[PDB]
UniProtKB/Swiss-Prot annotation:
Residue stretches spanning the membrane: 16-36, 42-62, 95-115, 167-187, 196-216, 243-263, 279-299, 341-361, 384-404, 418-438, 459-479, 509-529
Function: Transporter that mediates resorption of neutral amino acids across the apical membrane of renal and intestinal epithelial cells. This uptake is sodium-dependent and chloride-independent. Requires CLTRN in kidney or ACE2 in intestine for cell surface expression and amino acid transporter activity.
Catalysed conversion reaction: L-alanine(in) + Na(+)(in) = L-alanine(out) + Na(+)(out); L-cysteine(in) + Na(+)(in) = L-cysteine(out) + Na(+)(out); L-glutamine(in) + Na(+)(in) = L-glutamine(out) + Na(+)(out); glycine(in) + Na(+)(in) = glycine(out) + Na(+)(out)
Cytoplasmic topological domain: 63-94, 188-195, 264-278, 362-383, 439-458
Stated name of the protein: Sodium-dependent neutral amino acid transporter B(0)AT1
Membrane topology note: Multi-pass membrane protein
Disease the record associates with this protein: Hartnup disorder: Autosomal recessive abnormality of renal and gastrointestinal neutral amino acid transport noted for its clinical variability. First described in 1956, HND is characterized by increases in the urinary and intestinal excretion of neutral amino acids. Individuals with typical Hartnup aminoaciduria may be asymptomatic, some develop a photosensitive pellagra-like rash, attacks of cerebellar ataxia and other neurological or psychiatric features. Hyperglycinuria: A condition characterized by excess of glycine in the urine. In some cases it is associated with renal colic and renal oxalate stones.
One Pfam entry name: SNF
Entry-annotated residues carrying Phosphoserine: 3
Intracellular or extracellular location(s): Cell membrane; Apical cell membrane
Gene Ontology cellular component annotations, sorted alphabetically: apical plasma membrane; brush border membrane; extracellular exosome; plasma membrane
Domain of life: Eukaryota
Keywords of the record: Amino-acid transport, Cell membrane, Disease variant, Glycoprotein, Membrane, Phosphoprotein, Symport, Transmembrane, Transmembrane helix, Transport
Length: 536
């Protein structure tokens, strides 16, 4: 590590749009709303806000500050503190790959909808007629046409994770475009993104505002809004609610991934990373709540319309459930708009840009570290590494093109983007407070900011944050052993078809969990041992 001296000598609007790039993403617009409805609004929102202040901000500040200090990427930072801690960056890289795997699938879906958004009568605006034009399609009439276009016309979802059917070639063609668009950006887009984020980070708020204006003017919006902030104590006492809220914060802030550390690694040795952390954290949080208010306003409308056809509570709880919640909700909203096609295009364009940028940043979190690992003949240009990475991920991504793809994505998302992040977070915190030393840390921050971190930072970094990730971790093991795995299925032929049918995951589903959530979590401890033993 350089001496503080070595730094000061090696030293010799924008602020806000770079900051914006960190507050928006598919994690805040696609994942957040779906996880909320999974816990009945309030019971998720409340814990999520609590943990965004006690783990979010502290960890974010602790990331920006460590990478500003060491002037090294995530894989160099940890190895520098202590050599037996390379594992952290390695686990960071694995997690990044496992998220990019299904992040592109999301982006494939986004474009698909964009492709279908150039028709005066949008294809989800109503129900399709049977072969004899005798009535509406049954599955479509019992469910919503917006449900029908997501579940049948788009995904052609099966009824189990075991029933795979074929590969949805439409999805393939989009995913091919998504990966190709990604490869093109990785080769050149990188610099362009630095010049394009100025709109990609602003457009979201613009479009969301329009959708907020319509959402709040929809009958029943309030029913939705209040449901988002009235916690069901019983659910608020579930160890899985506090486990999911925990991971959501790390996924929204992009913490426990490595990008933020590398980003700060290129900041001035005197940049105030204490303000950056706060500003970014606040906006990122507002963004998620803002998106939830938009979505829940629409959910309220839909449910209220059914409580009218016929408590609203039950209706709201059974309005929209799953990963496609965002696609279904925002599409329903679009249908209720003048010249809908224009709005559909605007929305899918901004979502595609928000996704492309989010995915590009994630790709870096896989390629950069690999390059540093020096695991390839130097000759091989970054192109080779990137193309190879893209190709490999795309190949596995075909699992989501299957008719059971949605079931797969849900499974992976529930693990690949959860426990692993929690582990990395704790590891990082501990390594900086107990290995690197909190005292040294405080002095270094006092050298670049001028003052030592307040008591808040101290208590959070030393006790509260670590303790929280310990109890939440324990929860994970009281949930994995005290709750049989179950997933909802879309079976048109089933009593209360529109209702949810939570079936049990096959036994082979555990080998999947052990791979996605296990390898990255054990990468840190494994490497440590390797080094230690090798050290003797
Ligand atoms: C409030 O939340 C609780 C907690 O999830 C809900 O209770 C669940 O009800 C379902 C349906 O019968 C059961 O399968 C679960 O086992 C229950 N979980 C627990 C821990 O109680 C409840 O339905 C929600 N509704 C209310 C009362 O607001």
């Amino acid at each position: 590590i350089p001496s503080l001296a070595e730094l000061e000598t090696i030293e010799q609007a924008q602020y806000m749009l770079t900051c914006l790039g960190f507050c928006v993403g598919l994690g805040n617009v696609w994942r957040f709303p779906y996880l909320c409805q999974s816990h009945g609004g309030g019971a998720f929102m409340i814990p999520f806000l609590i943990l965004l202040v006690l783990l979010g901000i502290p960890l974010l500040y602790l990331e920006f500050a460590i990478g500003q200090r060491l002037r090294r990427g995530s894989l160099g930072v940890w190895s520098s503190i202590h050599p037996a801690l390379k594992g952290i960056g390695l686990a960071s890289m694995l997690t990044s790959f496992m998220v990019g795997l299904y992040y592109n699938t999301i982006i494939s879906w986004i474009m698909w909808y964009l492709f279908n958004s150039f028709q005066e009568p949008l294809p989800w605006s109503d129900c399709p007629l049977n072969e004899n034009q005798t009535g509406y399609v049954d599955e479509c009439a019992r469910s919503s046409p917006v449900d029908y276009f997501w579940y049948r016309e788009t995904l052609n979802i099966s009824t189990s994770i075991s029933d795979s059917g074929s590969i949805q070639w439409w999805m393939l063609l989009c995913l091919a475009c998504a990966w190709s668009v990604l490869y093109m950006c990785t080769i050149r887009g990188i610099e362009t993104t630095g010049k394009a984020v100025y709109i990609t980070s602003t457009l979201p708020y613009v479009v969301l505002t329009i959708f907020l204006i319509r959402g709040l003017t929809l009958k029943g919006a309030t029913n939705g809004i209040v449901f988002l902030f009235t916690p069901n104590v019983t659910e608020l006492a579930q160890p899985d609610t506090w486990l999911d809220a925990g991971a959501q914060v790390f996924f929204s802030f992009s913490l426990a991934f490595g990008g933020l550390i590398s980003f700060a690694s290129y900041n001035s040795v005197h940049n105030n990373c204490e303000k950056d952390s706060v500003i970014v954290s606040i906006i990122n949080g507002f963004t998620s709540v803002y998106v939830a208010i938009v979505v829940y306003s629409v959910i309220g409308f839909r449910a209220t319309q059914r409580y009218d056809d016929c408590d609203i509570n039950a209706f709201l709880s059974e309005a929209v459930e799953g990963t496609g919640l965002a696609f279904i909700v925002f599409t329903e909203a679009i249908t209720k708009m003048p010249l809908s096609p224009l709005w559909s295009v605007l929305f899918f364009i901004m979502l595609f840009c928000l996704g492309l940028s989010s995915m590009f940043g994630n790709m870096e979190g896989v390629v950069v570290p690999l390059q540093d690992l020096r695991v390839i003949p130097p000759k091989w240009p970054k192109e080779v590494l990137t193309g190879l990475i893209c190709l490999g991920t795309f190949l596995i991504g075909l699992i989501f093109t299957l008719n059971s793809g949605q079931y797969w994505l849900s499974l992976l998302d529930s693990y690949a983007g959860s426990i692993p992040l929690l582990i990395i977070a704790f590891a990082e915190m501990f390594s900086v407070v107990w290995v690197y030393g909190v005292d040294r840390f405080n002095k270094d921050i006092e050298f670049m900011i001028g003052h030592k971190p307040n008591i808040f930072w101290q208590v959070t970094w030393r006790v509260v944050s670590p303790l929280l990730l310990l109890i939440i971790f324990l929860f994970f093991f009281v949930v994995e052993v005290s709750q049989e795995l179950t997933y909802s299925i879309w079976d048109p032929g089933y009593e209360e078809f529109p209702k949810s049918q939570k079936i049990s995951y096959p036994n082979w589903v555990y080998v999947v969990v052990v791979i996605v959530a296990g390898v990255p979590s054990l990468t840190i401890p494994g490497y440590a041992i390797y080094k230690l033993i090798r050290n003797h």
